[PDB]
Design a protein around this ligand. Structure first.
Ligand SMILES: O=C(O)C1=C[C@@H](OP(=O)(O)O)[C@@H](O)[C@H](O[C@@](OP(=O)(O)O)(C(=O)O)C(F)F)C1
Length: 445
């Protein structure tokens, strides 16, 4: 079952906190550490349920994973060394773990079955299964290419040149991981850049992987298959998607001054910050530095008055997971915020466009949901927003919908209630404690 939570209007949020590790990089740390030759040591790993599930899947295939002190230590099997899993690989709510692992293991000559929760089971896998079919993988899936899915790789996979049809880092990632156990050169062409953790990390593990960007922005990513991968020391940066919740809360709640430490600033992950700045947000980037091979900085955020803006379709890939929290910020901005190019939101943990639109309307916000867009008109003072009757926002098992609306309740005249807070631990188990520490009033059922 589920457990509702209600956020109440708060006086200023104040403090300095370290945000939990980046989920995208954490998944990949377990995957590459488990596949590589030798030992991989990870500090700052996100210990949310999603990442733990990826770790269990890697253990099921031969990697030894353990936590010594604050460091995760992995003994990898070496590229080409994955062992046939005894049972289905359960990815729970994690699209990333599921999609990437399908590419990783689908090209091995043994059966692998993939299962997950009610949310993951409704999401499209065709975007990853199609290129795998081209590579020679045999696929048994449910209608619409949905889980459960059983894969059986060929004795010798076929390397392909695949142009990713939508701006998905997961599809790009799955094809590159499939390429690791495929002889020849696997090439992924990305017309619009998506988060590049797979490319950067594989290069760090020693893969012969190159990225060439045409002057028009198109990326050609080449990977030589069946090459050695060497265990690495990894230092995981703070999650910029998780940072978005206390960051927007500090912008919206009057009398606020919050500093978030060690935040990943890779530009494929900072579209929300750029957008909020255009809206008038007071976000100071402090001590930008290089840590664990990634750009990081600390962010000092103070209460700001915001004005609606137009958010272009080409900025979407760089903030795709932050549209829910951006929609909440827009509900308190002067004027209209217009966001298009949102088709991808409909296939996430929940259809995020529909879930955000319904939640906003339930909480008195004037907005228009289009097939691939959202327009939100705000009420800066928060009057008439929220839900006095205590009606709950339907989260549809999507932890980002739950966190976004809980942030809204810290600002609206009336409290905001979400029907379930249990999925927040999939990527941000520290959420309740972290927000409470800053002064937020959130009551869990
Ligand atoms: O490769 C990655 O690490 C991710 C790539 C993106 O998906 P696409 O390739 O489909 O654009 C994100 O939207 C996804 O984040 C979510 O990732 P999960 O499904 O839960 O794993 C999220 O955290 O909200 C989202 F997809 F739901 C994580």
């Amino acid at each position: 079952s589920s457990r509702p939570a209600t956020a109440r209007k708060s006086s200023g949020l104040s403090g300095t906190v370290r945000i939990p590790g980046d989920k995208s990089i954490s998944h990949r740390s377990f995957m590459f550490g488990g596949l590589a030759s030798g030992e991989t040591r990870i500090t700052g790993l996100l210990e949310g349920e999603d990442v733990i599930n990826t770790g269990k899947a890697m253990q099921a295939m031969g990697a030894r994973i353990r936590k010594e002190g604050d460091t995760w230590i992995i003994d990898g099997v070496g590229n080409g060394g994955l062992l046939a899993p005894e049972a289905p690989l359960d990815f729970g709510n994690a699209g990333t773990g599921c999609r990437l692992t399908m590419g990783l293991v689908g090209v091995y000559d043994f059966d692998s079955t993939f299962i997950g929760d009610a949310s993951l089971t409704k999401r499209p896998m065709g975007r990853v299964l199609n290129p795998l079919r081209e590579m020679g993988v045999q696929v048994k899936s449910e209608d619409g290419d949905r889980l459960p899915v059983t894969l059986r790789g060929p004795k010798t996979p076929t390397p392909i040149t695949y142009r990713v049809p939508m701006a998905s880092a997961q599809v790009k990632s799955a094809v590159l991981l499939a390429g690791l156990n495929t002889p020849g050169i696997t090439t992924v062409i990305e017309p619009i850049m998506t988060r590049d953790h797979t490319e950067k990390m594989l290069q760090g593990f020693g893969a012969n992987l190159t990225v060439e960007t045409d002057a028009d922005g198109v990326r050609t990513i080449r990977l030589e298959g069946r090459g050695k991968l060497t265990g690495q020391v990894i230092d995981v940066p703070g999650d910029p998607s998780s940072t978005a919740f206390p960051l927007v809360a500090a912008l919206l709640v009057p009398g606020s001054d919050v500093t978030i430490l060690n935040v990943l600033m890779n530009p494929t992950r900072t579209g929300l910050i750029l957008t909020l700045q255009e809206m008038g947000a007071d976000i100071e980037v402090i001590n930008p530095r290089l840590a664990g091979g990634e750009d990081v900085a600390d962010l000092r955020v103070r209460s700001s008055t915001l004005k609606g803006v137009t958010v272009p379709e080409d900025r979407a890939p760089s903030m795709i997971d932050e549209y829910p929290i951006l929609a909440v910020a827009a509900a308190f901005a002067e004027g209209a915020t217009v966001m298009n190019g949102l088709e991808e939101l409909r296939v996430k943990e929940s259809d995020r466009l529909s879930a955000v639109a319904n939640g906003l309307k339930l909480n008195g916000v004037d907005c228009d949901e289009g097939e691939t867009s959202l327009v939100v008109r705000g009420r800066p003072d928060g009057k008439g927003l929220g839900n006095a009757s205590g009606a709950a926002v339907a989260t549809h098992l999507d932890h980002r919908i739950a966190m976004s609306f809980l942030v809204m309740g810290l600002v609206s005249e009336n409290p905001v209630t979400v029907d379930d807070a249990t999925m927040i631990a999939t990527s941000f188990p520290e959420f309740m404690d972290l927000m409470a520490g800053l002064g937020a009033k959130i009551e869990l059922s």
